[PDB]
Design a protein around this ligand. Structure first.
Ligand code: BGC
Ligand code: NA
Lengths: 339, 346
């Protein structure tokens, strides 16, 4: 079934309940995922109204871009030309700059296919918006089906050469409670390398490091506490994890990662080359979710996209988008319950 | 009372009924007025869903900006610097460029004051959007009261020195039918001069002309047909009216314009210096409004703002906005009955 309701400030809340009784909800504010629940338990983090997002934290579950992550000095070069983007974190351009697409009301249309329901959100990024050449017509399709597969499909077209590399910012918490650390969760991840950060500014350091046999090797399922109790300078630098992991094998068919807690597991699939993992290293902040004080490590993201830092490490890839070219991306979060 | 419902594509329809039974409605898509009715008659032009606006004509009743009208070659000078804005009408920048504010979903909050209800829509124009320095935090408050006054209040603040001169794009048609020309309406307008357009591109000519005693003089109420039937060059150039009228006496207190049809009048008050009037000179385009094919001259706007062309005619004004300086503009449309005797035949 589908239900639509006012989410606050003119935003809407779209909730889909599949054949299994599983419920997922989104909002046009930032084309984002608001909740995901089973047997009355939430699997991800989210607020209860639009205002909260706006007052507390605008990132959770949002579509971020046009470029996800940090860009050193807000500088990108397009067609051999230097362009300076909005700087919203020191000299860096983080998640597209201030007041980005995650804070806009996107238009949308719901398409019911029976076993699957789709919600297509659309937004036009005007040429010059936050320094980015455009215009960029974008759409993000969130769909949910009877197999408990939540999928995100992106598309974009620009009138001019530009840069484009958005991501989905859902935070998972299989504990179903923000006051509870995800350290008890088990993680498996098909990445043998990672991108170290320079320093507390969180810009990339400049190199690619092999994680094989370190506290960050999750090629074999392991509990998070491990990584969390590590003395790796990199873990110590951010106070948990806040890094791009390079997937070993590319392709939407491969389970790139798996988050498990008890009989509940989330599998991640993407056509992207990297997964940025952030463990809600907020320390004492205590943001409130469902009236629950958030704890350091009370959440974890799987941001699938091209690794940030390509400006300095070209090997990472290239986020350019040429005029007329159609950008496409897909990421899937599949839910499974053991028997 | 207040009612809200989905209007399509994610936009909402906010409907107000005052104590007099008059209803009016708005949508967050372009912080725009959708309808205004009296005794079941539409006083304005509007569509029935959000998709219509996007598919047929996105301007009607919208809030347009950041700069209303045409900027020759999309060129503005901001604090000694030249800036080139999005050019969406040939080399011209018309109504802030492509996919401007009128096309966006604004957030909004409703404030019930009893005899008055306010709908405050908000949006942020990011720095550099369509070439405009920002960011610009904007808000438009549409309000309706028990006295039948519909008021629009604009507010804005920029992080950088920029330009700002927005307007409301409502179209009136007292016939309550798009297929009926407004040439049968009576018009009174407190303006002695107007700004002629150079040619079909519609940029300003460069001069200010005195229209007293011409077919464009409405200081004393006259039927619109007088204008429509005129062969004055300017009328012929645009096939009707599509010009800025320089108000003679400024001030929010003065009735600058009055549009009448029989027993109904719409009075216009504003704190702006000019009123740009466009009479839906669409020829046989025939856009469908409520299943009625719109006729040439099947509507009229009163866009209150600083006149367009100040780039070329400095005398018109200064639409610049200094960083940190707060912009405000107020326009009011008031509805009356039997204000005067208007008994004609066309
Ligand atoms: O689409 C509506 C537009 O039509 C043009 O002919 C007018 O000059 C514009 O001012 C008006 O907003
Ligand atoms: Na809504």
């Amino acid at each position: 079934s589908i239900k639509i309701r006012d989410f606050g400030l003119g935003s809407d809340l779209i909730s889909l309940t599949n054949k299994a009784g599983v419920t997922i909800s989104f909002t046009n504010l930032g084309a984002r995922i608001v909740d995901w629940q089973k047997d009355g338990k939430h699997l991800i983090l989210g607020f209860d109204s639009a205002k909260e997002y706006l007052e507390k934290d605008a990132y959770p579950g949002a579509t971020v871009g046009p470029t996800a992550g940090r860009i050193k000095d807000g500088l990108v070069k397009i067609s051999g030309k230097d362009y300076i983007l909005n700087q919203n974190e020191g000299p860096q351009t983080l998640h597209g700059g201030e007041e980005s697409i995650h804070t806009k009301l996107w238009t949308y249309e719901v398409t019911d296919l029976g076993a699957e329901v789709q919600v297509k959100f659309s937004l036009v990024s005007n040429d010059g918006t936050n320094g980015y050449p455009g215009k960029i017509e974008m759409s993000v399709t969130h769909s949910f089906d009877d197999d408990n597969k939540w999928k995100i499909h992106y598309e974009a077209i620009s009138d001019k050469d530009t840069v484009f590399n958005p991501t989905g910012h859902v935070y998972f918490n299989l504990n179903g409670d923000a006051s509870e650390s995800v350290e008890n969760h088990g993680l498996r991840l098909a990445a043998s390398r990672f991108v170290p950060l320079k320093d507390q500014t969180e810009i990339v350091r400049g190199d690619i490091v092999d994680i094989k046999n370190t506290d960050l090797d999750f090629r074999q399922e392991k509990q998070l506490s491990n990584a969390f109790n590590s003395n790796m300078e990199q873990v110590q630098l951010v106070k948990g994890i806040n890094h791009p992991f390079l997937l070993d094998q590319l392709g939407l068919d491969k389970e790139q990662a798996r988050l498990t807690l008890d009989d509940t597991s989330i599998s991640v699939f993407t056509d992207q080359p990297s997964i940025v993992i952030f463990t809600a290293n907020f320390g004492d902040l205590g943001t409130l979710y469902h009236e629950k004080k958030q704890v350091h490590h009370g959440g974890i993201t799987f941001e699938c996209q091209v690794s940030p830092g390509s400006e300095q490490i070209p090997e990472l890839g290239d986020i350019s988008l040429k005029a007329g070219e159609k950008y496409q991306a897909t990421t899937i979060y599949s839910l499974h319950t053991k028997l």
